[PDB]
Design an enzyme around this catalytic site. Structure first.
Site, PDB file in Angstrom:
ATOM      1  N   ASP A  65      -1.740   2.902   1.614  1.00  0.00           N
ATOM      2  CA  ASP A  65      -0.385   2.394   1.381  1.00  0.00           C
ATOM      3  C   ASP A  65       0.140   1.528   2.521  1.00  0.00           C
ATOM      4  OD1 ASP A  65       0.382   3.742  -1.410  1.00  0.00           O
ATOM      5  OD2 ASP A  65      -0.740   5.210  -0.175  1.00  0.00           O
ATOM      6  N   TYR A  95     -11.834   4.594  -4.061  1.00  0.00           N
ATOM      7  CA  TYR A  95     -11.424   5.751  -4.823  1.00  0.00           C
ATOM      8  C   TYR A  95     -11.656   7.020  -3.974  1.00  0.00           C
ATOM      9  CZ  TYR A  95     -11.624   9.532  -8.157  1.00  0.00           C
ATOM     10  OH  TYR A  95     -11.482  10.770  -8.784  1.00  0.00           O
ATOM     11  N   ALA A  96     -10.645   7.897  -3.932  1.00  0.00           N
ATOM     12  CA  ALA A  96     -10.754   9.113  -3.136  1.00  0.00           C
ATOM     13  C   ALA A  96     -10.831  10.317  -4.054  1.00  0.00           C
ATOM     14  CB  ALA A  96      -9.596   9.231  -2.149  1.00  0.00           C
ATOM     15  N   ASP A 101       4.982   4.060   7.136  1.00  0.00           N
ATOM     16  CA  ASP A 101       5.175   4.987   6.041  1.00  0.00           C
ATOM     17  C   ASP A 101       4.129   6.102   6.070  1.00  0.00           C
ATOM     18  OD1 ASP A 101       5.321   4.289   2.471  1.00  0.00           O
ATOM     19  OD2 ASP A 101       6.270   5.939   3.642  1.00  0.00           O
ATOM     20  N   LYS A 142      -4.785  -0.729  -7.556  1.00  0.00           N
ATOM     21  CA  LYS A 142      -3.341  -0.777  -7.261  1.00  0.00           C
ATOM     22  C   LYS A 142      -2.735  -2.014  -7.939  1.00  0.00           C
ATOM     23  CE  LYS A 142      -0.663   0.986  -3.704  1.00  0.00           C
ATOM     24  NZ  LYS A 142      -0.083   0.609  -2.400  1.00  0.00           N
ATOM     25  N   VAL A 194      -1.273   3.209  -9.265  1.00  0.00           N
ATOM     26  CA  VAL A 194      -2.718   3.257  -8.949  1.00  0.00           C
ATOM     27  C   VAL A 194      -3.462   3.894 -10.114  1.00  0.00           C
ATOM     28  CG1 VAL A 194      -4.488   4.314  -7.448  1.00  0.00           C
ATOM     29  CG2 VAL A 194      -2.476   3.179  -6.511  1.00  0.00           C
ATOM     30  N   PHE A 249       6.864   1.113  -5.065  1.00  0.00           N
ATOM     31  CA  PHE A 249       6.114  -0.132  -4.903  1.00  0.00           C
ATOM     32  C   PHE A 249       5.042  -0.381  -5.990  1.00  0.00           C
ATOM     33  CE2 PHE A 249       2.405  -1.702  -2.054  1.00  0.00           C
ATOM     34  CZ  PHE A 249       2.051  -2.606  -3.014  1.00  0.00           C
ATOM     35  N   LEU A 261      -3.536   7.480 -11.708  1.00  0.00           N
ATOM     36  CA  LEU A 261      -3.737   8.488 -10.694  1.00  0.00           C
ATOM     37  C   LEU A 261      -2.422   8.811 -10.004  1.00  0.00           C
ATOM     38  CD1 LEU A 261      -6.978   7.173  -9.058  1.00  0.00           C
ATOM     39  CD2 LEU A 261      -6.748   9.063 -10.710  1.00  0.00           C
ATOM     40  N   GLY A 262      -1.559   7.811  -9.911  1.00  0.00           N
ATOM     41  CA  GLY A 262      -0.342   7.958  -9.130  1.00  0.00           C
ATOM     42  C   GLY A 262       0.587   6.794  -9.298  1.00  0.00           C
ATOM     43  N   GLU A 263       1.863   7.069  -9.080  1.00  0.00           N
ATOM     44  CA  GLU A 263       2.877   6.054  -9.076  1.00  0.00           C
ATOM     45  C   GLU A 263       3.792   6.267  -7.908  1.00  0.00           C
ATOM     46  OE1 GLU A 263       3.192   7.122 -13.281  1.00  0.00           O
ATOM     47  OE2 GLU A 263       4.259   5.181 -13.503  1.00  0.00           O
TER      48      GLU A 263
HETATM   49  C1  LIG Z   1      -8.523  13.725  -7.824  1.00  0.00           C
HETATM   50  O1  LIG Z   1      -7.242  13.060  -8.163  1.00  0.00           O
HETATM   51  C2  LIG Z   1      -6.877  11.878  -7.556  1.00  0.00           C
HETATM   52  C3  LIG Z   1      -5.509  11.598  -7.487  1.00  0.00           C
HETATM   53  C4  LIG Z   1      -5.088  10.415  -6.870  1.00  0.00           C
HETATM   54  C5  LIG Z   1      -5.978   9.475  -6.325  1.00  0.00           C
HETATM   55  C6  LIG Z   1      -5.410   8.295  -5.758  1.00  0.00           C
HETATM   56  C7  LIG Z   1      -5.970   7.176  -5.091  1.00  0.00           C
HETATM   57  C8  LIG Z   1      -7.295   6.748  -4.898  1.00  0.00           C
HETATM   58  O2  LIG Z   1      -8.308   7.287  -5.292  1.00  0.00           O
HETATM   59  N1  LIG Z   1      -7.342   5.638  -4.149  1.00  0.00           N
HETATM   60  C9  LIG Z   1      -6.087   5.262  -3.872  1.00  0.00           C
HETATM   61  C10 LIG Z   1      -5.586   4.170  -3.140  1.00  0.00           C
HETATM   62  C11 LIG Z   1      -4.217   3.994  -2.965  1.00  0.00           C
HETATM   63  C12 LIG Z   1      -3.370   4.938  -3.528  1.00  0.00           C
HETATM   64  N2  LIG Z   1      -2.056   4.802  -3.371  1.00  0.00           N
HETATM   65  C13 LIG Z   1      -3.835   6.030  -4.257  1.00  0.00           C
HETATM   66  C14 LIG Z   1      -5.206   6.204  -4.439  1.00  0.00           C
HETATM   67  C15 LIG Z   1      -7.354   9.768  -6.422  1.00  0.00           C
HETATM   68  C16 LIG Z   1      -7.803  10.954  -7.029  1.00  0.00           C
END
Ligand SMILES: COc1ccc(/C=C2\C(=O)Nc3ccc(N)cc32)cc1
Ligand SMILES: COc1ccc(/C=C2\C(=O)Nc3ccc(N)cc32)cc1
Lengths: 288, 288
Positions: free
Chosen positions: B170, B105-106, B152, B57, B37, B34, B29-31
């Site tokens: 974070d 999860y968001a 942050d 994470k 994810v 640190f 989902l992301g980098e």
């Molecule tokens: C629709 O596309 C998405 C993109 C990133 C996320 C990222 C996270 C997420 O869902 N929970 C998280 C907890 C800590 C961090 N750094 C990132 C996330 C979720 C959905």
């Protein structure tokens, strides 16, 4: 703080300055930790008529005080250093825009990518492999003589220039050790766990001999044609595996004298590890 | 060192542990800085029958002692924290493989991406914009009450959950300030220069009031629908521009009461900035 002092002293401070108008930026070559490096071309660069193709190191987006600190430090280090196996600095642009360091462009990219896109016999002998290791050793003997600890020696931090010539780069984390022969960092360092010497990991102590340890990891990488150290073992497990005396096994297609050399760079006691001068002699032996 | 002590105490240490066999990892989902994810799903997670979709994470490749330290710290922090506008922790996996934190999860990703893929009126009023700011303020008032400095705070560090619900995330750089009401870091910090309060930049001092400063930068980001702070101004220029009293101009489509609020989060003197309680009141006013 220490940083605002450096930045202001830097903005007040030769023959390192380059007109920003004479530099043209192009594609991104690499990123990662601390900076971005883009291919560039520089007009009338330090006596050279016309354009010279160069690499340009700059701050990535959203830089922290730490990455700015590492950029200025790398600049301070590279000005003092000169060697056929160390990246060459041409200058910097600081005046009317972002800070940019203008460095030597390496036709073949990082040693890690170069190895990964090759095969053992792009075809490469083990004689070429050992030649690579050796050039790096000479580089390192020189910086050690300068009383400089690199700290971040790794295949991703070595460039392959024209003639398959190794160039040590990434002097962001390098530190001067003239006074005390050691660099000690109180907080947690930013060198990858899997390349750090056992005393650096537990005690935060860095010396030429912990550079020796990294060099052993780098040999392993060379021999494996760009393998990942301690494969499948999480970084946090390293404390215990190292202190309980564990080391990477002899990889495939590795001679016993080579593996014997890695094992010696990883002795627990920094004193029992070879020095770069004796490493270089060892490799030149192997190379015949 | 401090790290090997934490790692061993952690490996020796409840109801936070989750079977690694019950977790399934999916896309990244992301980098960034640190950690990494990844989207995941967890079987029979803390009383919930079947699978729950979660985020996981973990350490990126080649983690430094510093990133490992930040991962364990984020875990220690998230266990103590509970609030509708703070990311929820479910557990961790530490036993037979890499360290993984299992978090909420968001559905909509980071606030920065959410804003950037939208438009002012995906269509969003300024009433939605201010609602976002407000939810974050409540989150922050809570952590401030816990005597926690986030450090942050930024749009990339806020998640948009179901219902367009803001979640602060974070907690890698967060620090406890119960004793002294300040966190002081001797070495250079890893927070992006453009989000740091003036005293954090020059003096390395972090308090709830420097969180207030970051919140002002974050408001700016919200209002600009994901703009880049201080556009086109290099980070190193910030020392002098800040100390000489300069601040970002009122952006477009920003009301005067909103810009007035940012300007107050950026007062030179940490004491003249509002506290999150009064920020929240200010935003609830604006929202009508
Ligand atoms: C629709 O596309 C998405 C993109 C990133 C996320 C990222 C996270 C997420 O869902 N929970 C998280 C907890 C800590 C961090 N750094 C990132 C996330 C979720 C959905
Ligand atoms: C064929 O593809 C290439 C890939 C990367 C490079 C990278 C660099 C380069 O050329 N000079 C550099 C100096 C410092 C750092 N970090 C990187 C570089 C060059 C060529």
């Amino acid at each position: 703080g220490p940083l605002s002092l450096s930045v202001d002293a830097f903005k007040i401070l030769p023959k390192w300055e380059f007109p920003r108008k004479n530099l043209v930026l192009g594609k991104t070559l690499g990123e990662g930790e601390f900076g971005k490096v883009v291919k560039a071309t520089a007009f009338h660069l330090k006596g050279r008529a016309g354009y010279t193709t160069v690499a340009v190191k700059m701050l990535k987006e959203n830089a922290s005080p730490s990455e700015l600190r590492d950029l200025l430090s790398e600049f301070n280090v590279l000005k003092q250093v000169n060697h056929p196996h160390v990246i060459k600095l041409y200058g910097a642009c600081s005046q009317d825009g972002p800070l940019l360091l203008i460095v030597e462009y390496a036709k073949y990219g990082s040693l890690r990518g170069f190895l990964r896109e090759s095969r053992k016999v792009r075809a490469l002998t083990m004689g070429d492999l050992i030649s690579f290791a050796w050039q790096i050793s000479q580089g390192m003997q020189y910086l050690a003589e300068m009383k400089l600890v690199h700290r971040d020696l790794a295949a991703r931090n070595i460039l392959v220039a024209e003639g398959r010539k190794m160039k040590i780069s990434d002097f962001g984390l390098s530190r001067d050790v003239y006074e005390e022969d050691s660099y000690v960092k109180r907080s947690q360092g930013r060198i990858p766990v899997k390349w750090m010497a056992i005393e650096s990991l537990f005690d935060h102590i860095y010396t030429t001999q912990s550079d020796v340890w990294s060099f052993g990891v780098l040999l392993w990488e060379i021999v494996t044609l760009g393998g990942n150290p301690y494969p499948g073992i999480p970084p946090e497990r390293l404390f215990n595996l190292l202190k309980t005396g564990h080391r990477m096994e002899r990889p495939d297609n590795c001679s016993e004298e080579m593996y014997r050399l890695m094992l010696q760079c990883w002795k627990q006691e920094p004193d029992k590890r070879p020095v770069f001068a004796d490493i270089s002699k060892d490799l030149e032996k192997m190379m015949v």
